[PDB]
Scaffold this motif. Structure first.
Motif, mmCIF file in Angstrom:
data_model
loop_
_atom_site.group_PDB
_atom_site.id
_atom_site.type_symbol
_atom_site.label_atom_id
_atom_site.label_comp_id
_atom_site.label_asym_id
_atom_site.label_seq_id
_atom_site.Cartn_x
_atom_site.Cartn_y
_atom_site.Cartn_z
ATOM 1 N N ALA A 1 -1.203 -32.966 -10.448
ATOM 2 C CA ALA A 1 -0.521 -31.676 -10.789
ATOM 3 C C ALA A 1 -1.458 -30.452 -10.802
ATOM 4 N N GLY A 2 -2.742 -30.669 -10.501
ATOM 5 C CA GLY A 2 -3.734 -29.588 -10.434
ATOM 6 C C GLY A 2 -4.935 -29.769 -11.344
ATOM 7 N N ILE A 3 -6.109 -29.348 -10.861
ATOM 8 C CA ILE A 3 -7.400 -29.580 -11.545
ATOM 9 C C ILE A 3 -7.434 -29.072 -12.991
ATOM 10 N N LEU A 4 -7.166 -27.779 -13.187
ATOM 11 C CA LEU A 4 -7.262 -27.154 -14.512
ATOM 12 C C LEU A 4 -6.397 -27.868 -15.546
ATOM 13 N N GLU A 5 -5.111 -28.061 -15.220
ATOM 14 C CA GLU A 5 -4.147 -28.799 -16.054
ATOM 15 C C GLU A 5 -4.691 -30.160 -16.480
ATOM 16 N N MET A 6 -5.074 -30.972 -15.500
ATOM 17 C CA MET A 6 -5.593 -32.311 -15.756
ATOM 18 C C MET A 6 -6.856 -32.290 -16.614
ATOM 19 N N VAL A 7 -7.783 -31.381 -16.300
ATOM 20 C CA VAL A 7 -8.951 -31.104 -17.157
ATOM 21 C C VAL A 7 -8.483 -30.728 -18.570
ATOM 22 N N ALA A 8 -7.590 -29.738 -18.653
ATOM 23 C CA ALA A 8 -7.040 -29.236 -19.920
ATOM 24 C C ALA A 8 -6.324 -30.312 -20.728
ATOM 25 N N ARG A 9 -5.852 -31.350 -20.039
ATOM 26 C CA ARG A 9 -5.171 -32.500 -20.635
ATOM 27 C C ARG A 9 -6.168 -33.586 -21.053
ATOM 28 N N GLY A 10 -7.463 -33.275 -20.965
ATOM 29 C CA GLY A 10 -8.531 -34.173 -21.418
ATOM 30 C C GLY A 10 -9.199 -35.048 -20.367
ATOM 31 N N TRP A 11 -8.779 -34.916 -19.108
ATOM 32 C CA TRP A 11 -9.314 -35.726 -18.013
ATOM 33 C C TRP A 11 -10.591 -35.127 -17.437
ATOM 34 N N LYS A 12 -11.512 -36.007 -17.060
ATOM 35 C CA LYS A 12 -12.716 -35.611 -16.342
ATOM 36 C C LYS A 12 -12.394 -35.411 -14.868
#
Ligand code: CA
Ligand code: CA
Lengths: 136, 136
Positions: A1-12
């Motif tokens: 669903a997109g880098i920032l979102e996934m990062v923001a959701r706690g993913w590396k």
């Protein structure tokens, strides 16, 4: 669903993939069940660079990865179904490993923090774990 | 490998399939790992006849079977890729099951010796298990 979102959701994020480093420990299989429910699988290591990131981000804590035998007496495969390079793995196992201690070691974990960091161990050992998910 | 050859090793034969009933307790995945080393999977259930053979041979002792969820939050399926009908299974579940206690019961077993014997329980519980290898 997109880098920032996934990062923001706690993913590396590292090189075309998202990673999830588990806040609690589970058995290899209960870890995989979680990764499936996170649209992922217990991680693969498909390069030396990805190995470098993965041992670093593990923080010297033993993390389950996605290497497992095709049956208790079979060869290793990646659960995410990428190719397993038997020869490249040489530089990834802790010296002495895989040792198949007490003939009950069919799942592999990042145990230490070095290029050579994998250990084969009991599948019902409870460790932290890494879900891998493509950036697609 | 021959009907009489298998029963002469400790496999059970019924209606076109061989089945290995275990001696020692194991988790769902290690049970499944052991299955594959013996060219089998954990048992799928296609007909009431199969259910009856399985629950009567299980003797009241809990036995893991090849029913698991596609992750901790996904759908029930057979690990040997037999197609799982939810409507047929309604007959076999213990009334009030699968309850999914603590959102944690992600594997199924034959809990008791009755037609309504299926309970969902955590994949990390250690029970005796039933492998199944088809006769061809
Ligand atoms: Ca070892
Ligand atoms: Ca239950």
């Amino acid at each position: 669903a997109g880098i920032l979102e996934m990062v923001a959701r706690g993913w590396k994020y590292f090189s075309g993939n998202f990673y999830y480093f588990s806040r609690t420990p589970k058995t290899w299989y209960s870890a995989e069940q979680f990764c499936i429910s996170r649209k992922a699988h217990l991680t693969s290591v498909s390069s030396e660079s990805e190995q470098k990131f993965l041992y670093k981000a593990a923080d010297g804590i033993p993390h389950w990865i996605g290497l497992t035998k095709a049956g208790s007496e079979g060869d290793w495969y990646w659960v995410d179904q990428t190719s397993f390079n038997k020869e490249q793995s040489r530089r990834f196992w802790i010296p002495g490993e895989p040792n198949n201690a007490g003939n009950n070691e069919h799942c592999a974990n990042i145990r230490v923090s070095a290029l050579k960091c994998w250990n084969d161990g009991p599948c019902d050992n409870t460790f932290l774990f890494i879900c891998k998910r493509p950036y697609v």
